[PDB]
Symmetry: D3
Subunit: 303 residues, 6 copies
């Protein structure tokens, strides 16, 4: 029958049916929003990202038939579990709400998609994956975000992965791609290298993308964490702290596609999108497509 | 339990449960969006109004306890039937789907709320009230919008009530308040007076508000049509063609309040809001509140 | 035949035919733009005002038939003489070009309309009225703009009327209405008072508009200078240096209408509009209408 | 010597010299910024308010010679103590630092000026006045902000005065002006009325301003708290949660001027300004002027 | 002697004299605007493109002397035929208005430049070339736009070339370059391949541009259709539905240049520009330049 | 002691202490702003660049430890000398004040950093380097800016280097990189080559960046002039007159890094940034970083 235009209808991710995190449902893919941005240290706005991403996803409703007539995500079911009910302030309670909602959504779908929210949400999100043996994380990011303490707190967006690792012994490895900038936390760098994490600077992606893909995990359980600031600001300006010369959409997608075809993807988060910082709206439109395209890749290699 | 903050959760009007127009449900108040703006003659954007109003309504979730301790809308149930599935172009087809959806929603609730969309939507919207005896329309508008033909079309936003009157013999009277501007369609004015419609220029409201309220219907079946451009552009700048020296929120609400308490309100539409034209977002916030406050007035004097 | 919508066609003031300042033409009203804003002391943008005003005037193309069915500006011819060709910097050269173009335009129309541009343009514009006996200026403005020197220059926008008076012995009186703000140049205020100029603070307008209209000139040759910041910033926010609690559109219009009904209007300038500072676009829309409505009043009482 | 233009120089409040809160200085007036906005429940941005207000204050540098030729704030010294060094998250720590910095600034000046920041900062700010006998607070606000708990926290901006009262037995009375809206916390309203607070709805100001001025404290130790949302959104749209029909700049200023003429002003805060929500920039220009004008009134009646 | 700066003068394309489509004039190049955008399915704004392009063209007024000292477009005359007078709605009438105006302009110049407008305008525009033998079209676009039916209409901006081909058997071939995205209409793709149209995905331009150029027509009558969304969103963000990883300005220009060097160019349209979606203004500045540079290429290879 | 987050504290360049140009101080690096933009010929805004650059520099406070573990800018002291006090208009007086302030700053630091301001400030800035033997200028720019007269003035931003060369016989050579665009001043190109100046078009950079670095000066006294428009508009859209296909941040930096490693850097200016033209704020963030990264290269290799 007739379908809504992007500007029509209630905005749910992939225009999927709306459900409750603890409701009686099941789907191949389930979206969950985390409108939390009080942990970032510069420009707020990421709390509006979940809503912006849902709206932008109406431009990319599955399934998809490419120029080659091949159709992806054909038959794959989606669901939108709404957003985590967050309190004001109270970061600890917020973290607990996030982990609980994440647990519920995880048990009702195959591949859960978390929409941030600043990067600090990745920590409580990952806590819902403690039972995943030898959990690996493929992180697209301009920064390492493995810092211990910053501005007198352990919960800033610069510390999510540091917090996750000390709370999840099953999180055995992180591969970070896209790092750049004038400042790096030496303590954080040393801590990541001490745990054997893989650090891939944007310089290496530019110099030899093939070699970078050859460094990605294989036959592993992988959780994808995409910080939109990993992408070049020209491409995705909507983010609090942009760094020049980043990933093109194509490069970021190639890394995600490669990792999705050789691993068991257990989930993915999309964080640091700041809609208010991009009045052209391309940031959310492109990141919404990124998620959908990644899912296409994920389900094109399910065993 | 805990409640979402305005930036959290899926945006449904008044944060009410989502439903289908011809679905199996019933409620006191039901919202229906009509993201149609190709009929206006200047600045587009109203197609995004339904979505903006839903989001802004999260700042005004019922019920409401005033400073006097009194609570309003207690026990009143709300529902959101989404938006009419409109085609691209094809105005005649759009009109038919609008009316059908309006009919379906009106038969499932007591007071239906229609979110435009340019003012031309009022026509196919009123066609769903053909069975209301001696139907009266109280319209807040900077313009009369009773034009026959404009720019070689009969379906522009300048002709909704002219179209509605020729298609509905039961629509017996219209009271338009807030009229102003340098240009008036003489043929439209003549046709309106010929039918005995009441025309109340903004000057009348300014000179004597009490006299204006005395001209409102009493004990009649009333359909409310609120064109946001009836309000002063300083108050509501988010609209295609603003006209200086309009209604303050308070004046417009006083009119709606008086009419609501003295009549049987059969419905209401809120049109011409253009979110894209007000980056401060106050336009949607105030108009979302206007709809809720009007509803407070309506259900506060139910017989 | 069919007429363009506001967004269609080449933007000329009031959609009037385009002409050259010294060309072979004659019209009742002729517009001339002065896209000069390098003399203001705060936020630039007024250089774009002439263009924005033309675009906005397409929403106010004459003639106008009001609610009473009466028509104004019927048969009144319009022309757009384009813009003065300004150099970069070189204020004195710019001034000479503005005066020359204004003189040429004045000699080919009854009422010239000058679109600024920061307020400093009023000086060279006025030099073109050296032959007007006992020239009076009715100035709507939040600021006096009668300063001798400011920031080491004689040509800032804070000095146009001071420069005008010293260059035109025939400019015998100025009536300034709308003044407000924490700071005033004591020398400028005292000099204006000592010259017999009339200073009407906004507080007087609020306290007794009737008393203010009674202070306006009668039977004089009047030049209207409208600085948009004379209007309340809530109404017209698009201006460099806004001051709270100003004229509503209605008050400013009543003042101009009163003066137009009892005097011989020789010209009008509209200055300090900064379109870039009002993304809602209501500033240029309302100010273009003010010019058109003022002309309606002018030609309704011309002798 | 030449003076800077508004867009020139380093932006310190009123172009005052920069000092450390606990440094070796003394001045009549001292500004202290609190760029904290993680406690608000809707739209962020107030963290940028202290900076925006400083920049805007460059348009209002003291002293001021008015239209009447009289000068105010002549010889009155100013100091800018910078901003409280805030951590990320960690509300309690932020609170303690805010109180400590405020105490130190207070002991070094006659009248401290605090620039927020969301309204939650008023709580830690007021703790620095625990020694003031019979401390009265005059609050301009659209909301009461006397809530005990909201969204699972005691520190939201909706609870500053509630926290202040239960922590300051010397805070004997609060006069709140401008209240309006559909939703009010019944528990908060009751608790406030019970403690003997004076609640003055905006409707009261509209109906009789003279009466409202008579309800203000007299001969008391007064702390001013100005929430920019107390002003009408058409005038000051840059704020998280606007409410229609608020104070005009003039009405708000009349209230402050009245209170400043009959009491001993011990301090003032300006909170909830969101520059990012007003691209016209009028919100910060007008609120910076409000602070300066209030200081003019305070020093005109120094006992 | 002196010339206007970009912000000065009436904005006509290339600052060319204004003429009527059916007036008595002749010029090498003539521009015609089609401010129509009610056919697109997402974000409106293209109706303002013709005006934005005209304004932006003031930064690219011919002739042009390059770094090598060689001048292009020397002696090439220009004219601006204004905009097609469009009705409100009534797509079929608009289509006829467009075709007739386009033919009139075509009979008075050598190369016509059409300024859109959503991509649907290409259909009625092409009907004006029904008298051209073996008409070839070189289409820069992110989408094929060869769809038959979409959202219950035949006239959406997704069907222009489909409508053109079935109405113009003389349009023997189309070469589309820049195709990309997750969704492709299998029906449209088939109909295109069937007619033998050449489809060149953006991946092919990236893989080997020289190969793509070798696929362009030679010695044919060619019409250029440039959809701005064919360019990368980072470069041209001002467009309704952006797609990542597109043409750089240089790539698009290389394609246009190659085709203009060995073909008879009969016209060109520039569509889907949405100035309202790019507040930096680079979208219109770059596309106006693209048109002018394309003309430089065309007149550098005339037989 | 704790450190301010980017949105906290008074915005001075690199959070450096404030000083007066002719005060008693010394520092390795000193910043001086020149908020002058009345000489540009298109879109103003550059007057706001010094303040935006200072605000943005708070995200790049020295020293910097890279991913490789090396730390740069260690032991490098900074000072912010504020802004040159500019008059209104009076370009000659402005020039004199700029030169004088630059002289004072240069005599108190090792590497002065000048924040513009339109490009015309480079002329009076360079006059402060008259005692530098065989002075060389490495200019990143989309335009040559070696024009004699433009729009009836010798002081436009298109003439800074022409004016500098005729005033400074010691300015023996200029290397300009990034030139592009359809129009070039033939008289300026000829005069530049006549003097042996090296012109390096963007095409050369794209074709062989290694070769361009090879063409940079070696062992000379070099003054860096960075016009942000030398960069691609997709990367840095905030500038008056953008030209497509410009330098990536990386390319521009590589050029500066190379020159800084093989020459004595006497100073650097950063001009034409227009914060108001880039609402995403990435323009000032990337350019402030550029200045800081250039400084780290300078001190990491100085003789």
């Amino acid at each position: 029958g007739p379908a809504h235009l992007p500007y029509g209808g209630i905005p749910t991710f992939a225009r999927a049916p709306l459900v409750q995190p603890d409701g009686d449902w099941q789907a191949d893919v389930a979206a969950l929003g985390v409108p939390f941005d009080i942990a970032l240290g510069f420009r707020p706005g990421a709390r509006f990202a979940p809503r912006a991403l849902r709206e932008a996803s109406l431009r990319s409703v599955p399934p998809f038939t490419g120029l080659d007539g091949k159709t992806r995500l054909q038959g794959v079911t989606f669901a939108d579990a709404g957003d985590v009910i967050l309190p004001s302030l109270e970061p600890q309670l917020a973290h607990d709400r996030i982990t609980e909602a994440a647990r519920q959504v995880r048990g009702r779908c195959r591949v859960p998609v978390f929409l941030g929210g600043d990067h600090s949400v990745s920590y409580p999100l990952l806590r819902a994956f403690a039972d995943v043996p030898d959990l690996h994380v493929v992180q697209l990011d301009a920064h390492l975000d493995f810092t211990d303490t910053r501005n007198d707190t352990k919960w800033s967006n610069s510390s999510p992965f540091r917090r996750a690792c000390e709370a999840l012994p099953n999180l055995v490895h992180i591969t970070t791609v896209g790092l750049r900038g004038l400042r790096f936390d030496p303590e954080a760098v040393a801590a990541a290298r001490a745990r054997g994490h893989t650090i891939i600077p944007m310089d290496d992606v530019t110099a030899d993308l093939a070699g970078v893909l050859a460094q990605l995990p294989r036959g592993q359980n992988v959780y994808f964490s995409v910080d939109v600031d990993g992408f070049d600001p020209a491409v995705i300006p909507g983010t609090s702290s942009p760094e020049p010369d980043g990933l093109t959409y194509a490069q970021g997608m190639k890394i995600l596609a490669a990792a999705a075809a050789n691993n068991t993807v257990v989930g993915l988060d999309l964080v640091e999108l700041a809609p208010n910082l991009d009045p052209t709206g391309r940031s959310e439109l492109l990141m919404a497509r990124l998620v959908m395209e990644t899912l296409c890749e994920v389900f094109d290699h399910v065993l």
